[PDB]
Amino acid sequence: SRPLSEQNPPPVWFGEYLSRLRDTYAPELPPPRQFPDPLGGLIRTILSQQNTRRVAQRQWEVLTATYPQWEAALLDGPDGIEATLKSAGGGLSRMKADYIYGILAHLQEHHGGLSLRFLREFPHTPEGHEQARQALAALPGVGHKTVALVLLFDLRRPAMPVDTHMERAAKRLELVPAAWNSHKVERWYAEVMPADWETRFALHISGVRHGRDTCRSKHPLCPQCPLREFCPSASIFE
Ligand code: SF4
Ligand SMILES: [Cl-]
Ligand SMILES: [Cl-]
């Protein structure tokens, strides 16, 4: 019909929103994920979803102690993976084992191997980024949020993953309307943002911390918001 940034243009202060988020919540940027193989990083992202970061890090250590090669996890099948995930305290062990095992046995049957290293070889052009996006999207169970996370964290490609916490804040800011689902919010940010890996990385990290730590689902901390003078929603909460 018409690109989403046309139907809802960004505000004048949008650059100041980026600079307050960065200065407040991530003045020092964490490093990118440099795992041996992008497949490790995708598994790492799955572990962290609907999880505490404390258990997610524990499951990663235990999963890779248990399966030094991802080939070992494939041979163990979803039941052994589930046992391994559950042994580290996870709460979604059956679902995630079927998910992870489905990605592995998919790679093996259709690529003869369990490696995503070919994702690194696509050109760093607009087309090549879209090639890597498409390749991640062909994997069974991997949705747009997880595609963007792996592009941003594991491949240094300028995707624009937006976390649920960040989306909730953007809507309270009325940067984007309530009608829009997560995939549209992601597309809008990818249109309004400079296509620079670092700046998008800085936004994702800073935007999550703000939405998680300041703009909480219940009882947001509007008076400590650096974005307070900009947010229409501050008056409702305060
Ligand atoms: S002003 Fe309040 S509701 Fe608006 S983004 Fe900041 S914390 Fe969230
Ligand atoms: Cl790996
Ligand atoms: Cl789990």
Residue numbers in the entry: 87 to 324
Authors' own words:
Endonuclease III (EndoIII) is a ubiquitous bifunctional DNA glycosylase belonging to the helix-hairpin-helix (HhH)-GDP superfamily of DNA glycosylases. It is active for a broad range of oxidized pyrimidine lesions, removing numerous forms of modified thymine and cytosine bases from DNA, such as thymine glycol (Tg), a major stable oxidative modification of thymine, via the Base Excision Repair (BER) pathway. D. radiodurans possesses three genes encoding EndoIII-like enzymes (DrEndoIII1, DrEndoIII2 and DrEndoIII3), while other bacteria typically possess one.
Despite its preserved fold and conserved catalytic residues (Lys and Asp) DrEndoIII3 shows no detectable enzymatic activity towards common EndoIII substrates at standard assay conditions, however it possesses the highest affinity for damaged DNA. It was also suggested that the lack of activity could be caused by substitutions of conserved Thr and His close to the catalytic Asp (Gly250 and Asn251) in DrEndoIII3. In the case of DrEndoIII3, we substituted Gly250 and Asn251 with Thr and His close to the catalytic Asp as in EndoIII2 and Arg139 with Asp, in order to disrupt the π-stacking interaction at the entrance of the catalytic pocket. Neither DrEndoIII3 G250T/N251H nor DrEndoIII3 R139D demonstrated any activity towards these substrates. For DrEndoIII3 GN250/251TH the EMSA results indicates that the GN to TH substitutions had no effect on the enzyme affinity. The crystal structures were determined and refined to resolutions of 1.38, 1.95 and 1.89 Å for DrEndoIII1 R61Q, DrEndoIII1 Y100L and DrEndoIII3 G250T/N251H, respectively. Additionally, the DrEndoIII1 R61Q and Y100L crystal structures include two magnesium ions, and the DrEndoIII3 G250T/N251H crystal structure has two chloride ions. As for DrEndoIII3, the lack of activity was previously suggested to be caused by a poor steric fit of the substrate in the substrate binding pocket (demonstrated by MD simulations).
